[PDB]
């Protein structure tokens, strides 16, 4: 209808996705003025809870809080850093769909990057790949068709052809 993703997950915990997911970020700062715990209420206003935006904004509202020195501004520049470095690793993680364990790592021929084109495919372990025909076995990257069958052969040989378990 309007054209933008909706998204309704929550029925009776998070009730508000406003006024609670903005509330609780205990597990964000766990660290940030790791020099005295006790010294204030984190300003809602700002929110802190982007990660990215915190890492540049002009000085002209980020002082009326009471004790800001040195130390405390360095502190926030390096968990600022950290925020950085945990951003980063989270898309590393969501962008990383792939988990390329050893059961796709040990079949010979594939390596590393055809073990990532494979999981990129869309599969992750060995009784869906002699599913599939060489009509299937294209789109490869550094892999041509009788490579694709000799290689689908030599899988259906080991998973299908061994009755192993």
Same mark, same amino acid.
């Given at each position: /209808?309007?054209? =933008?993703?909706? *998204?309704?997950?929550?029925?009776?915990?998070? #009730?508000?996705?406003? #006024?609670? !997911?903005?509330?609780?970020?205990?597990?964000? +700062?766990?660290?940030?003025? &790791?020099?005295? !715990?006790?010294?204030?209420?984190?300003?809602? @206003?700002?929110? +802190?809870?982007?990660?990215? @935006?915190?890492?540049?904004?002009?000085?002209? @509202? /980020?002082?009326?809080?009471?004790?800001?020195? !040195?130390?405390?501004?360095?502190?926030?520049?390096?968990?600022?850093? *950290?925020? /950085?470095?945990?951003? %980063?690793? %989270? #898309?590393?993680?969501?962008?990383?769909?792939?988990?390329? %364990?050893?059961?796709?790592?040990?079949?010979?021929?594939?390596?590393?990057?055809?073990? +990532?084109?494979?999981?990129?495919?869309?599969?992750?372990?060995?009784? &869906?790949?002699?599913?599939?025909?060489?009509? &299937?076995?294209?789109?490869?990257?550094?892999?041509?068709?009788?490579?694709?069958?000799?290689?689908?052969? %030599?899988?259906? *040989?080991?998973? =299908?052809?061994?009755?192993?378990?």
């Amino acid at each position: /209808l309007s054209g =933008w993703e909706l *998204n309704v997950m929550t029925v009776d915990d998070l #009730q508000a996705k406003h #006024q609670a !997911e903005a509330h609780a970020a205990i597990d964000t +700062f766990t660290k940030y003025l &790791d020099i005295d !715990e006790d010294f204030a209420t984190v300003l809602v @206003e700002e929110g +802190f809870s982007t990660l990215e @935006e915190l890492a540049y904004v002009p000085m002209k @509202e /980020l002082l009326e809080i009471e004790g800001l020195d !040195e130390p405390t501004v360095e502190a926030l520049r390096e968990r600022a850093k *950290n925020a /950085l470095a945990t951003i %980063a690793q %989270a #898309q590393e993680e969501s962008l990383g769909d792939n988990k390329p %364990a050893d059961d796709l790592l040990n079949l010979e021929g594939v390596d590393r990057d055809l073990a +990532f084109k494979l999981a990129a495919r869309g599969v992750c372990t060995l009784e &869906d790949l002699a599913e599939q025909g060489i009509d &299937d076995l294209a789109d490869i990257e550094g892999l041509t068709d009788e490579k694709a069958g000799a290689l689908i052969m %030599a899988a259906r *040989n080991i998973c =299908w052809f061994g009755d192993e378990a």
